[PDB]
Every structure is written in C-alpha cells, then in structure tokens.
Amino acid sequence: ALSLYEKMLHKGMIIKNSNVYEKIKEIDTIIFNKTGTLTYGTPIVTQFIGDSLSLAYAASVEALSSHPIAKAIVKYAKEQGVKILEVKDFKEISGIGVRGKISDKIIEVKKAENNNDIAVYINGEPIASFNISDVPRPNLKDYLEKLKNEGLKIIILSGDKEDKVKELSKELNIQEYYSNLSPEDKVRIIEKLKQNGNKVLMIGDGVNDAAALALADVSVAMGNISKNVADIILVSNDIGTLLGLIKN
C-alpha cells in the first residue's frame, strides 16, 4: 500500500494540502480560465496584411523581445522568407507594444483598434496589421459527463472579445461564459458566486488568475515550481485527469 499522496502523484496530481479531499465533495461549480486550460496558451499568426518590406521591419523589432506575441510574429515571418535586419534604440514599453529604428525610419508595433489585433506604424502612419490566435486543446469535454458527474454548473472566464469566446463556447455546449474581463473582474465574479450559495472549484495557470485562484474553494493550477496558491497541481498537464478526479 502507498500513501494517498503517493497514489494521487502516480495519477498526475500534486496535492499541496491534505484538506482538499473533503472540500471537493461539496463542490457544485466548475470555472475555467480560458487561456492555458481549454487552450495550449500558444499564440499563432492567422492573417497578415501588408507587403514584404513592412513584414521585415516589424519582425526585426520583435526579435529583441521575449513576449509570446513577439515570438509568434518572428516565427511566421521567417516562414515567409524574411531576413532579420539590424535595429537601434529598441524599447519595449511593457503592457502596450514595442519600438525601434531602421534606415532612419521609426517603427512601432502594438494593439490595433477595430477588427484587427496588432498594428504596424512607420513614422506615425499605420501601414500593416496582423490577426493572432490561440489553439484549442485536442480532446474536448465529456462536459456532459461533467454535467453528469453531478449537477455541476460550468462557467468560462476570458479576457478575449465576445465572438472568440462565444465561438469556443458554442463549440463545446457551454451556455454560460463572460468575455472581456480584467483580472479584477474575475475576482468580483468569484466573490458574488460564493456570497450566494455556490461552492467553487477553479482551474487556471500562473498569470491573470493568481488572485482569483486564491479566493476559490478548491484551486487547480497547470504544471506549466513554487505554484504558491493552488490546492492541486496538475503535473500531468492533461485535463482528463481531474475530469476523472471529479467523479469519486
């Protein structure tokens, strides 16, 4: 025989406190933080509008960053045959975009307004754009089974726009989702849910959900260290494990 700790570990789960076992039997609500749980959390370019010079200019600035956006753009550009050019006065204004200088021209890359995600400026003039997406995880949910495993209420939280969340949502038979949320919004939703009856299990990663996870009745964090908050760490990185955990 092994400890119950040893048995959970063998299954793909690290139990950060032995008190979680009794706590889960009471759970009535499952909340997914979209990015990194229902998706791989890996951005990919789905469309570029502009010509090959603009593409080279934007790529050559993004190369000096480590942002996941930067890496995707640079990856796409080399696949199109772009050669990376020498940049100066680089600057990555955290939380907005990036910038640099080439052949006397000033190049900025940042968030775009209407129907695109990212925009490229040359000396103040907008001349090209990108659309960027995540990838949904292979399997899917016998989410019915989740809605069978008990009478479980299921909810999706996302920072993305209404039609990207709604698409994924309808894709998977989940009618309750909230789009466009700030980190502080998610905290407000969890507080209201607890304040009127519900016992909440929440799955997230390590980003704009640290505070939300700390507030839930039972927290689950992805393996992708000192995972601080969570009751349970899914080293498996496979959502099927806990899916199995739910039923007990």
Ligand SMILES: C[C@H](OP(=O)(O)OP(=O)(O)OP(=O)(O)OC[C@H]1O[C@@H](n2cnc3c(N)ncnc32)[C@H](O)[C@@H]1O)c1ccccc1[N+](=O)[O-]
């Ligand atoms: C990262 C991503 O999206 P996210 O999570 O929303 O972005 P975030 O990590 O919160 O970045 P912040 O909130 O610090 O930057 C604010 C805004 O300035 C722009 N921006 C920021 N940095 C840059 C840059 N180096 N170059 C161009 N634009 C930028 C950019 O438009 C950004 O929205 C992502 C990550 C994982 C999976 C899937 C995806 N995905 O989107 O598919």
